[PDB]
């Protein structure tokens, strides 16, 4: 892990630096987008000058035949139309290869991530991951994907996606590998105009363990801040569509009696479910007092508002004026919060919303019953090991340019 790290690209003072201790020099050439909510992740374009070049330390420039090593990062690959990207053409995004094409290379194809390793002689080996088109909800398209590559010179080279091993090939037939002095983050030879997101690039001087890859997958993003649908930080005062992870083919619509329905099947474009369907919500801080940033953290006290128009917002509340155990979620047209709050929490990328009374009493987690979105306390004792456990897990879909559906 941190002991074996020889290159850690992190953000500091309007630039990117190496925090491994070997003092590698990172430079930005052109227009490199920096995410304002998380400046460690950056975007590179191909319609203009946009690249990030890492001049490695002379110590860490790989020039061995037996030393194991690993490479880790996260990549975000948008599929704007799911038609403009339908071109069989391999294009390189990360290039640590010399003039004689010795070294390593991370390239992309249509819904495909390719790893290539070549020695000084020219013997090469390739690993690949094809996640394919979306069949319902895709966990990879326009989302942050954790890529890890381990290399045992006396054994196999393995590729891991989100901590799961997916492709291993022997590299025993490769000799001396002298990688490039530079690590170039740039989109080259791409058939179309696009951008690519990269974050948390790390180089280790050993073959990473599976548990080490899992710890990296779980702790590199901030575990205290909630995540949205794409894997970015969940934001306050930001419009989001809702997605229930147990019924991913359904969306939430508004009823005339202020209740919320779930019997609405998502329309499909080819085999991909439409993401921008249903009601829109906004998260608002209860106790503002200018508490730093707009990031939604665990155990936060928030209000969930429904967006009727661009200017009109109406709080969502749990109707406790019923004999049922589960409380249906209603829209307060008057603006009355009904003396309730919502507590945010998360398991991994999935978010939970606990409706609570102001006196501290629990009303329940946000889930659904039959046709209607409700708040229920049952989810408290059945967070796992039940077919209905995932009914309280929600994803917030932000309408972005990287995912277009018309």
């Amino acid at each position, epitope marked *: 892990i941190k002991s074996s790290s020889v290159l850690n690209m992190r953000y500091k003072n309007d630039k990117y630096v190496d925090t491994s201790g070997y003092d590698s020099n990172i430079n930005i050439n052109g227009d490199v987008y920096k995410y304002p909510t998380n400046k460690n992740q950056f975007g590179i374009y191909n319609d203009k000058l946009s690249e990030v070049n890492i001049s490695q330390n002379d110590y860490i420039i790989y020039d061995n035949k037996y030393k194991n090593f690993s490479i880790s990062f996260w990549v975000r690959i948008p599929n704007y139309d799911n038609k403009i990207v339908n071109v069989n053409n391999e294009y390189t995004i990360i290039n640590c290869m010399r003039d004689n094409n010795s070294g390593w290379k991370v390239s992309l194809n249509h819904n495909e991530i390719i790893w290539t390793l070549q020695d000084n002689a020219g013997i090469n080996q390739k690993l690949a991951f094809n996640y394919g088109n979306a069949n319902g909800i895709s966990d990879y398209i326009n989302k942050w994907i954790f890529v890890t590559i381990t290399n045992d010179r006396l054994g196999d080279s393995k590729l891991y996606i989100n901590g799961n091993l997916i492709d291993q090939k022997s590299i025993l037939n490769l000799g001396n590998i002298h990688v490039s002095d530079n690590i170039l983050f740039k989109i080259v030879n791409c058939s179309y105009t696009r951008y690519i997101g990269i974050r948390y690039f790390n180089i280790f001087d050993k073959e990473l363990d599976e548990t080490e890859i899992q710890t990296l997958y779980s702790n590199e993003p901030n575990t205290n801040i909630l995540k949205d649908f794409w894997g970015n930080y969940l934001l306050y005062d930001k419009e989001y569509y809702l997605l229930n992870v147990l019924k991913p083919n359904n969306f939430i619509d508004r009823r005339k009696d202020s209740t919320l329905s779930i019997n609405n099947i998502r329309s499909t474009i080819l085999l991909a479910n439409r993401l921008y369907s249903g009601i829109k919500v906004k998260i608002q801080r209860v106790n503002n007092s200018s508490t730093n940033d707009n990031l939604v953290r665990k155990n936060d006290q928030v209000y969930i508002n429904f967006v009727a128009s661009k200017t009109h917002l109406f709080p969502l509340y749990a109707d406790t004026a019923t004999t049922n155990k589960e409380k249906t979620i209603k829209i307060s047209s008057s603006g009355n919060r009904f003396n309730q709050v919502v507590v945010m929490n998360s398991v991994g990328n999935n978010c939970t919303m606990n409706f609570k009374n102001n006196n501290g009493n629990n009303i329940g987690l946000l889930g659904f019953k039959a046709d209607t979105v409700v708040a229920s306390t049952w989810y408290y004792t059945h967070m796992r090991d039940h077919t*209905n456990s995932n009914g309280c897990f929600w994803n917030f879909i932000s309408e972005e340019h990287g995912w277009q559906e018309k």
Partner: nanobody
Amino acid sequence: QLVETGGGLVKPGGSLRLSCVVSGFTFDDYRMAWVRQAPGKELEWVSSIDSWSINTYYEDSVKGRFTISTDNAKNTLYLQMSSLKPEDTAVYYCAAEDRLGVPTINAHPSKYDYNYWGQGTQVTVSS
């Protein structure tokens, strides 16, 4: 298309077999239920069955006399009522709940406690 049949007039102590034909979904994705409605009372849940796990649920004032059942094809729901009392004179409705929802059972359910309601069959216990 939820349709119920088998209700009618019986004397105290008689027997009936209510059946409920279902079109559009199987009992593997839905939990089935029988709910009663007295003329001057609100809706009262009678019974419920899961087809994936044969665990059944009954109400206290009705257990022992009623038996809920499901056919091997999972398209027809049955309720065998025996030793009928005059308190059972009500309209009986077939109901279907999404199994993936919150599995709580309300004794006085509203219309949103189940996905689909039937047309209702009348059961009368009179001399």
